[PDB]
Amino acid sequence: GIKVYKPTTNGRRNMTGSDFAEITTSTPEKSLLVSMSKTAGRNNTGRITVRHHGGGHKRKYRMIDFKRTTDNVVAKVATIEYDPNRTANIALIVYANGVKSYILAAKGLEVGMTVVSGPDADIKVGNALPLANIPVGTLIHNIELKPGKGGQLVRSAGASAQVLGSEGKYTLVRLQSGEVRMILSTCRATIGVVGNEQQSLINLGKAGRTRHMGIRPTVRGSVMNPNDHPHGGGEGRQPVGRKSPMTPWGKPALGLKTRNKKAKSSKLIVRR
Amino acid sequence: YDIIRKPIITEASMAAMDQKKYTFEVDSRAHKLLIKQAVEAVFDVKVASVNTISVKPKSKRVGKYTGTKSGYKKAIVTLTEDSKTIEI
Amino acid sequence: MKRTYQPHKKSRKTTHGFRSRMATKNGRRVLAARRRKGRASLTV
RNA sequence: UAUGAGUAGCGCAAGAUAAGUGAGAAUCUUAUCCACCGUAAGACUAAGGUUUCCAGGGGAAGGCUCGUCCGCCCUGGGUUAGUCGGGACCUAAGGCGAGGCCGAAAGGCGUAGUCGAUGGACAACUGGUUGAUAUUCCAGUACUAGAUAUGAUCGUGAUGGAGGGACGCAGUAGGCUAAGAGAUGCCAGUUAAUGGAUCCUGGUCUAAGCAGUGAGGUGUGAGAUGUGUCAAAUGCAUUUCUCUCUAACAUUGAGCUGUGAUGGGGAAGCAACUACGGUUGCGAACUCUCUGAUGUCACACUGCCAAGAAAAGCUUCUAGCGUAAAGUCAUAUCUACCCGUACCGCAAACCGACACAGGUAGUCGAGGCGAGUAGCCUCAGGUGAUCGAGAGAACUCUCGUUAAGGAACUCGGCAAAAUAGCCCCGUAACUUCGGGAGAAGGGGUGCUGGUGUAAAAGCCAGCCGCAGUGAAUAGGCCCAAGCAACUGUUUAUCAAAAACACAGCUCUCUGCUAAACCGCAAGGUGAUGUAUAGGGGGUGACGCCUGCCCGGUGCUGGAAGGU
RNA sequence: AUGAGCAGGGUGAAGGUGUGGUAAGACGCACUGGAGGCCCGAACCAGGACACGUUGAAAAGUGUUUGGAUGACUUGUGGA
């Protein structure tokens, strides 16, 4: 879903348009209170601590149902709203008790589908079953190794997820890129699909509109000083033959993997 | 109790006399309601209120070093009528 | 052009007030140097 | 203490005479003209300055000269609040942080909590008033909150529960109004030199209340299951429907209409006396037309994506409520704290060592032309900014000209020149199809009467002109190539670019208490992020294309053996 | 983080609408309509060039041109 801008002026040359085109109207709900926060990368210490960054707005976040540990209710979707934050969109929900709960939206849902889990429900889009209930070869997200603990894992803005299999205590699941974790089988799960898909291909001309995105620009390492970077500056834009260029910090970057195989993990793996 | 400092005699003091007002001084650690009722006690004069103002200290030179003359809270005694003015 | 100090009252304090200087166990030490010398004043 | 040297400079703008003043006047004061600024060089207001203000007196230094003058000096006064700004309210960003966490120590972190305005909460506004204070002093009107005095009656209804406050940007339309123009109307002068009358002030009302309205949004409600509102709730949103969506109704609302409020304001002037300077007193109409805002409704609406503070004051619900005058309204009269309040503030008080040629919030900001807050001359207002006189040397620098010729000068049309306004014609090249492009080039442009221009140009004829955006103010163009796409950013105290950056494109790393990073750790970022995300490396749109070589290096992976 | 702004005037997209257009869309021309690192040009913010001065008004300027001029703007406030 991508319109264009007409190439009127320079800078407005390509300007791959939005096609929001789908989202319910405007005005997100006011008791969706999450306080705004900008570390701007810099820490408790606060020098920079974290690279090129900054320049968005007072991004008034809002509580999505990260966990959805609720039960078998008319969990009515009402609206699918815009997200400033994350790539997929979002949706309001009222239960029987008259609450304002709120979920990540999907591809093809609609207001009044009221989709819910006990894990009573079947395989239709929007159920928080565990994979102990979900059969083989399905398209899920929101599976996190800690039961009673919502999205930290591959509930994914972007595309959703898939599941190959399961055995015993765990679940043989791909994420992307030929990767499988085996997750605790009675941990919750939301069958379905991501909200937005094409929000990987929008090209936007102005450096300043990427500043409206909110990252101050990224320097190359090249013309930087020997004081600055292992790209040893000198005559011209000279090449770098200095054995696989790297961070301004002190480790090589290309190639090597840095697994930390000595983890609370690695018995939950794929070949890669 | 009588912690009124002194009166103040300007050319506006006679305008205060015609206005049934005064220009009296007290210590800094004060309140216009408190010196109001103190004035009511030792004077039996019927006060409307007092204005606010104090004076900064005047640090000029007085002598061969700097005359660090101090400020004082110029109390504008706003009376009502039908009471005892004091002509001192 | 523009010069360094065009301070306001918050500006002239909030680095050098008696609790600011007193605070960090350190500026009060150099204030105590300023006392053991005992110059024209202390806090500014 | 010389010296240079009585030389540089005398710190960006024009005063002038007469009279006073004194002892001594250029430079002090007045009068009278001139002059300048005037989207300011006005007024008012932040920070700041910290009394510089004013009155009187004086002139040791200071004033870049003089100096009776002064931001200089002595002396004396000068700043007034229930409502103005803050605090006695709340809270962001942040800071401190008992608890706790870790750490040789000091420490550094941090839950509760605590302060922290530039924010959000809320009553007063007109007139007069000094040498100076005015929303502060007082006349008139309030309102806010409390008090004690006084017919309630069970009522209050919380830290809970809601609601609400409560918010992005752009742009258009009105609505009204400040504000301005024109005449009605009022007051005073028919001016003196051809002419011979028209001349300029005129031109009020404050908010609060009382009652409505420009109008706006807004859908409403009712019933039942409540399923909940960590307890409860009649308050709330939704289960389900009767509807019924007239929008009645809930809900806000510029201005105006009267009232408020007949309030003294108001000039030529008039008298009086106070020097007759001045003060006191007295005294005019108070109309309408037209423009009318970016102010106003009001982020009201429309529209578009970078999707847009906070709590608290406030309402509602009940847990409670001696609920018995807690409550509660009438009633009555008082009260309403503390700090700040003067002046200057585009500036001789600020910050530039200085009476400096910088910098310095914000809000208003006249007419006439004029789109215009640009010009240009005069409003209101304010100012003459600090050494002058001579003489017009040469020279130095800012300005105006120039035959004839043109860039022949020079490394280089470098600087200056010249063009530009508005309208109306017209407009190549390639193009990523928008542009180019104001391409270029062309024409017009004053006034008089018509007629048509008022909504409205063009007509006609004439009058003229050296000249018709009469001056001011306001593009030199073209061809071609290289580099860079572009806008941005770039060494303030040299260098703005081909340098950086940038979307883009490429690769690689990271499945999460991420990787990476910061810190001894703790803690935290990364991000309430989840591989379309995060980190690193390259290159820098779009179009085409990215060929070969794993010997070596590094990387990755593997394990037989050596080590 | 909270705020303040940033005169005017063109330009004209997208969007929307309606009819000729269409089986029906694509099309036609209106109408809105302004989005826009749009343009000119004020304040404002810079400093490209040039002259002046350079023991300078000045520890970094003046003066004349020049750019941006609704943004990656400018900048108050108060912080790290």
Residue numbers in the entry:
A (entry chain BD): 2 to 273
B (entry chain BW): 4 to 91
C (entry chain B6): 1 to 44
Paper text:
We report a novel mechanism of ribosome dimerization via a long-HPF-type two-domain protein.
We furthermore obtained a density-map of the L. lactis 70S ribosome as part of the dimeric complex at 5.6 Å resolution, and were able to confidently align two copies of the ribosome to reconstruct the 100S structure thus significantly improving the density at the interface. Along with the rRNA, we successfully assigned most of the ribosomal proteins except uL1, L7/ L12, bL9, uL10, and uL11. Additionally, we assigned protein bS21 in our map, which is absent in the model of B. subtilis ribosome. After localization of all known ribosomal protein subunits, two regions of undescribed density remained, which we assign to HPFlong. One density is located at the interface between the 30 and 50S subunits, and the other at the interface between both 30S subunits. The C-terminal domain is located at the center of the 30S–30S interface. The C-terminal domain of HPFlong is thus a dimer stabilized by hydrophobic patches and intermolecular β-sheet formation. From the perspective of one 70S ribosome in the dimer, the main interaction is between its uS2 protein and copy A (randomly assigned) of the HPFlong C-terminal domains; whereas RNA helix 40 and most likely the N terminus of bS18, interact with the copy B. Chain bS18 also interacts with RNA helix 26, which seems to be involved in the dimerization through interactions with helix 26 of the opposing ribosome (at least in L. lactis).
